């Protein structure tokens, strides 16, 4: 009669308030050796939407093997159904088994090798459990991993363009692994879409996490940060002052190929860079970041052509394809055409004389468009300052910040 007592207690507690005793009761479980939970699952979930049975689903997923016989997908639908109808703030009252259940579902989908059914689930399971859009939860990492394994980078964009400013405590748990996973997979997603300006920032946030040991997410994020910095800028950007001492003492020696790559990508010489890339092919292809180095090779020529504009005013195509080592006027012409199309350079091509003329006039600041841009930037700064002032006022009233 233990099951009868449990279901009666759940029914009485539901639609009656006092979530504390319900949470205590549902936490007073785990002895559910009776694996006939299927019939009792869809018998008590009608009352008060879906706030209970979370422990039942967590127990079902705990098995890790032979969960619900060859109809395991049916269990998935239940989870799907739950995620579509749980709702309410009762889930937030137990935001420790929700994240655990999402982790179990993500692991099951990854092992099953169908990492696209859950993209729609750990998208309504994120905004339904977090406080606001600027609150980082432990399901962002799972969503990024799932939408990365199956190459669907568009669903995660609304969850990456937001600047996280609070982190869920999740009633415990939430180690730094979730932080590193989110800020590493988001950077890899942004790199895949060639948004280097934000991939570099994500990798920088991954590296500067406080650390006392070495993990294989802060290493193969520093290594990718170097490459993205070389592709976007012309140099390896300096990490912030508040970085931990692990990267500057232990992580750096393992990344010795990439520092050699930067050093060659410090003196403008495509031949030397190609020689080094071919020499270290095994190292760059073992870490799976091959094809991000060929981007550095193809960006060296663009950097050289841009540096040509700082000195010259009209350059022959044959003359241009001798200082940047492009091997022919036609290749130089196509490089300049591609650069003009992408907006990287301001130049014009004269096929009559076979010349390229450099203009270098982005914009004169005398139009209402720049006024609108300035207004938008100032609005962003105003919102930033308002949030800072709100945080300071919330820290001023703290009783702990009254005795000191």
């Amino acid at each position: 009669s233990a099951l009868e007592q449990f279901v009666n207690s759940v029914r009485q507690l539901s639609a009656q308030g006092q979530m504390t005793q319900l949470c205590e009761l549902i936490n007073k479980s785990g002895e559910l050796l009776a694996k006939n939970l299927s019939h009792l699952d869809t018998v008590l979930g009608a009352l008060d939407v879906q706030e209970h049975s979370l422990g039942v689903l967590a127990v079902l997923f705990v098995k890790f093997s032979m969960p619900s016989v060859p109809d395991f997908e049916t269990l998935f639908s239940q989870v799907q159904l739950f995620i579509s109808t749980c709702n309410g703030e009762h889930i937030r009252y137990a935001t420790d088994t929700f994240a655990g259940l999402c982790h179990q579902l993500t692991n099951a989908l990854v092992e099953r090798k169908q990492p696209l059914r859950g993209i729609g689930i750990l998208k309504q399971a994120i905004d339904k459990m977090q406080m606001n859009t600027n609150q980082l939860t432990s399901i962002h990492a799972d969503l990024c991993q799932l939408c990365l394994l199956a190459k669907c980078f568009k669903p995660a964009l609304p969850y990456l363009d937001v600047d996280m400013m609070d982190i869920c405590k999740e009633n415990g748990a939430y180690d730094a692994k979730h932080f590193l996973c989110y800020y590493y997979y988001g950077g890899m997603i942004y790199t895949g879409l060639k948004n280097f300006e934000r991939a570099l920032y994500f990798y920088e946030q991954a590296i500067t996490t406080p650390a006392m040991a070495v993990s294989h997410i802060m290493l193969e994020s520093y290594k990718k940060y170097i490459l993205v910095s070389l592709i976007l800028l012309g140099k390896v950007q300096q990490l912030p002052k508040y970085t931990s001492q692990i990267v500057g003492r232990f992580i750096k020696p393992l990344s010795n190929a990439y520092h050699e790559l930067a050093q060659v990508y410090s003196t403008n010489n495509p031949s030397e860079l190609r020689n080094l890339v071919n020499k270290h092919s095994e190292t760059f292809t073992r870490d799976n970041n091959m094809g991000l180095v060929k981007q550095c090779l193809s960006s060296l020529y663009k950097k050289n052509i841009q540096r040509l504009t700082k000195t010259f005013l009209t350059l022959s195509l044959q003359d241009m394809a001798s200082r940047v080592q492009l091997s022919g006027p036609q290749e130089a012409e196509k490089y300049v055409l591609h650069m003009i199309e992408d907006g990287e350079i301001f130049a014009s091509i004269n096929q009559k004389d076979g010349m390229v003329s450099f203009h270098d006039n982005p914009e004169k600041y005398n139009n209402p468009a720049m006024l609108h841009n300035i207004d938008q930037e100032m609005l962003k700064c105003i919102e930033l300052d308002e949030r800072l002032k709100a945080m300071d006022q919330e820290i001023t009233v703290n009783p702990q910040f009254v005795q000191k």
Partner: protein, 173 residues
Amino acid sequence: FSFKKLLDQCENQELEAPGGIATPPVYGQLLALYLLHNDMNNARYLWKRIPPAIKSANSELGGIWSVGQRIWQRDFPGIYTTINAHQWSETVQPIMEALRDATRRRAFALVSQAYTSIIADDFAAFVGLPVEEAVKGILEQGWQADSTTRMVLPRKPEQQLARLTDYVAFLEN
């Protein structure tokens, strides 16, 4: 606007799916609409994640990816050659026909903004029209087409007071 809505519907239908895998028609529509909006990264990833069984079953995806690969290398003669090599039944025809017009406008704008003297043959190859058609088309625009040397010369193409009050009220607190 009529294509963006169809793209959004196709994306949502693919995302929901009967188990992750979508039907070949929506896959082809998604790939072609990614080619339309110059989403080369998204089109490449969609081709990467399309199941090999669907590629074997439906052979039009091969032609759509051939067109996309010609677009990816920025090969305008290849784009125009490969566009007119396959068709479907009112599924990809409007989008594959708007792709041609989009490529035409893109090539014309690129020639206008990136050149000061371009040969007639090169201009025709960029646009895709025959040489005589290419020269005779630019008549109202006045591009100064030359003879003998056949050189084409492209032609280079309220709330304020409230905002200021908000700025001051922010600064003065």
